[PDB]
Design a protein around this motif. Structure first.
Motif, PDB file in Angstrom:
ATOM      1  N   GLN A 255       7.264 -25.328  -3.611  1.00  0.00           N
ATOM      2  CA  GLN A 255       7.279 -24.163  -4.499  1.00  0.00           C
ATOM      3  C   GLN A 255       6.818 -24.539  -5.901  1.00  0.00           C
ATOM      4  O   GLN A 255       6.100 -23.771  -6.544  1.00  0.00           O
ATOM      5  CB  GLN A 255       8.645 -23.461  -4.571  1.00  0.00           C
ATOM      6  N   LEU A 256       7.213 -25.712  -6.394  1.00  0.00           N
ATOM      7  CA  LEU A 256       6.796 -26.109  -7.736  1.00  0.00           C
ATOM      8  C   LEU A 256       5.277 -26.196  -7.837  1.00  0.00           C
ATOM      9  O   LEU A 256       4.668 -25.632  -8.755  1.00  0.00           O
ATOM     10  CB  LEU A 256       7.446 -27.440  -8.111  1.00  0.00           C
ATOM     11  N   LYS A 257       4.643 -26.885  -6.884  1.00  0.00           N
ATOM     12  CA  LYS A 257       3.188 -27.000  -6.908  1.00  0.00           C
ATOM     13  C   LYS A 257       2.523 -25.639  -6.738  1.00  0.00           C
ATOM     14  O   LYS A 257       1.560 -25.315  -7.447  1.00  0.00           O
ATOM     15  CB  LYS A 257       2.719 -27.973  -5.825  1.00  0.00           C
ATOM     16  N   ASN A 258       3.027 -24.821  -5.812  1.00  0.00           N
ATOM     17  CA  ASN A 258       2.424 -23.515  -5.579  1.00  0.00           C
ATOM     18  C   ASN A 258       2.529 -22.628  -6.812  1.00  0.00           C
ATOM     19  O   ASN A 258       1.570 -21.940  -7.174  1.00  0.00           O
ATOM     20  CB  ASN A 258       3.081 -22.842  -4.373  1.00  0.00           C
TER      21      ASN A 258
ATOM     22  N   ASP B 203       0.130 -23.799  -9.517  1.00  0.00           N
ATOM     23  CA  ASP B 203      -1.219 -23.351  -9.187  1.00  0.00           C
ATOM     24  C   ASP B 203      -1.393 -21.859  -9.454  1.00  0.00           C
ATOM     25  O   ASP B 203      -2.431 -21.428  -9.972  1.00  0.00           O
ATOM     26  CB  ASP B 203      -1.532 -23.677  -7.726  1.00  0.00           C
ATOM     27  N   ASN B 204      -0.399 -21.049  -9.083  1.00  0.00           N
ATOM     28  CA  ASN B 204      -0.493 -19.615  -9.332  1.00  0.00           C
ATOM     29  C   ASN B 204      -0.574 -19.324 -10.823  1.00  0.00           C
ATOM     30  O   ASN B 204      -1.366 -18.478 -11.257  1.00  0.00           O
ATOM     31  CB  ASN B 204       0.700 -18.893  -8.706  1.00  0.00           C
ATOM     32  N   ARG B 205       0.254 -20.006 -11.620  1.00  0.00           N
ATOM     33  CA  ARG B 205       0.162 -19.891 -13.070  1.00  0.00           C
ATOM     34  C   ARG B 205      -1.233 -20.250 -13.552  1.00  0.00           C
ATOM     35  O   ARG B 205      -1.778 -19.593 -14.444  1.00  0.00           O
ATOM     36  CB  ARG B 205       1.206 -20.789 -13.735  1.00  0.00           C
TER      37      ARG B 205
ATOM     38  N   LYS C 194      -4.004 -19.844 -11.867  1.00  0.00           N
ATOM     39  CA  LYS C 194      -4.874 -18.711 -11.550  1.00  0.00           C
ATOM     40  C   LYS C 194      -4.704 -17.572 -12.549  1.00  0.00           C
ATOM     41  O   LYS C 194      -5.690 -17.056 -13.084  1.00  0.00           O
ATOM     42  CB  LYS C 194      -4.649 -18.194 -10.125  1.00  0.00           C
ATOM     43  N   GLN C 195      -3.462 -17.146 -12.801  1.00  0.00           N
ATOM     44  CA  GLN C 195      -3.283 -16.007 -13.703  1.00  0.00           C
ATOM     45  C   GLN C 195      -3.749 -16.342 -15.115  1.00  0.00           C
ATOM     46  O   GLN C 195      -4.356 -15.501 -15.790  1.00  0.00           O
ATOM     47  CB  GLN C 195      -1.836 -15.500 -13.732  1.00  0.00           C
ATOM     48  N   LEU C 196      -3.468 -17.559 -15.586  1.00  0.00           N
ATOM     49  CA  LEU C 196      -3.880 -17.936 -16.931  1.00  0.00           C
ATOM     50  C   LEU C 196      -5.399 -17.976 -17.050  1.00  0.00           C
ATOM     51  O   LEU C 196      -5.964 -17.492 -18.039  1.00  0.00           O
ATOM     52  CB  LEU C 196      -3.262 -19.282 -17.304  1.00  0.00           C
ATOM     53  N   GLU C 197      -6.083 -18.540 -16.048  1.00  0.00           N
ATOM     54  CA  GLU C 197      -7.542 -18.548 -16.068  1.00  0.00           C
ATOM     55  C   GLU C 197      -8.096 -17.131 -16.028  1.00  0.00           C
ATOM     56  O   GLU C 197      -9.061 -16.812 -16.732  1.00  0.00           O
ATOM     57  CB  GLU C 197      -8.087 -19.365 -14.895  1.00  0.00           C
ATOM     58  N   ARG C 198      -7.498 -16.266 -15.206  1.00  0.00           N
ATOM     59  CA  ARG C 198      -7.954 -14.883 -15.128  1.00  0.00           C
ATOM     60  C   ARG C 198      -7.827 -14.192 -16.477  1.00  0.00           C
ATOM     61  O   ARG C 198      -8.769 -13.546 -16.949  1.00  0.00           O
ATOM     62  CB  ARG C 198      -7.157 -14.128 -14.062  1.00  0.00           C
ATOM     63  N   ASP C 199      -6.659 -14.312 -17.111  1.00  0.00           N
ATOM     64  CA  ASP C 199      -6.455 -13.669 -18.404  1.00  0.00           C
ATOM     65  C   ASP C 199      -7.407 -14.226 -19.451  1.00  0.00           C
ATOM     66  O   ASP C 199      -8.004 -13.466 -20.224  1.00  0.00           O
ATOM     67  CB  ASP C 199      -5.004 -13.839 -18.855  1.00  0.00           C
TER      68      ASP C 199
END
Lengths: 48, 53
Positions: free
Chosen positions: A33-36, A39-41, A43-48
Motif C-alpha cells: 500500500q505504501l508504494k502504491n 505512485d498514485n500521489r 500520478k495526481q501531482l504530475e497531472r495537476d
C-alpha cells in the motif's frame, strides 16, 4: 499428562507459526500500500 | 515375579518421566523462540514500513 501437554503445546506452536507468517504478510502488504499510494500521489501531482 | 515387575515398571516410570520432561523443555524452547522471532519480525516490519513511508 504427556498427551495433553503435547497437544496443547503443539497447538501453541502452530499458533506462533501463524503469528509469524501473518506478521510477514502484513509487513509485505503494508509496503505494498505504501508504494502504491506513493505512485498514485506521483500520478495526481504530475497531472495537476 | 513381583520384584521383577516392580523393578521393570519403576525403571519404565523413570524413563517415561524422562521423555515427558524432554518434550516439555523442548516444546517450551520452541514456543519461546517462536515468540521471540515473531516479535523480531513485527519490529522489522514496523521499521521497514516507517522507512518506506
Amino acid at each position: 499428562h504427556r498427551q495433553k501437554f503435547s497437544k496443547e503445546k503443539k497447538e501453541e506452536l502452530e499458533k506462533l507459526k501463524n503469528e509469524i507468517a501473518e506478521v510477514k504478510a502484513e509487513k509485505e502488504k503494508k509496503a505494498s500500500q505504501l508504494k502504491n499510494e506513493l505512485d498514485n500521489r506521483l500520478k495526481q501531482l504530475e497531472r495537476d | 515375579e513381583l520384584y521383577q515387575e516392580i523393578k521393570k515398571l519403576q525403571f519404565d516410570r523413570n524413563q517415561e518421566n524422562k521423555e515427558y520432561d524432554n518434550e516439555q523443555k523442548d516444546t517450551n524452547l520452541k514456543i519461546q523462540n517462536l515468540k521471540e522471532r515473531l516479535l523480531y519480525k513485527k519490529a522489522r516490519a514496523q521499521l521497514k514500513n516507517q522507512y518506506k513511508e
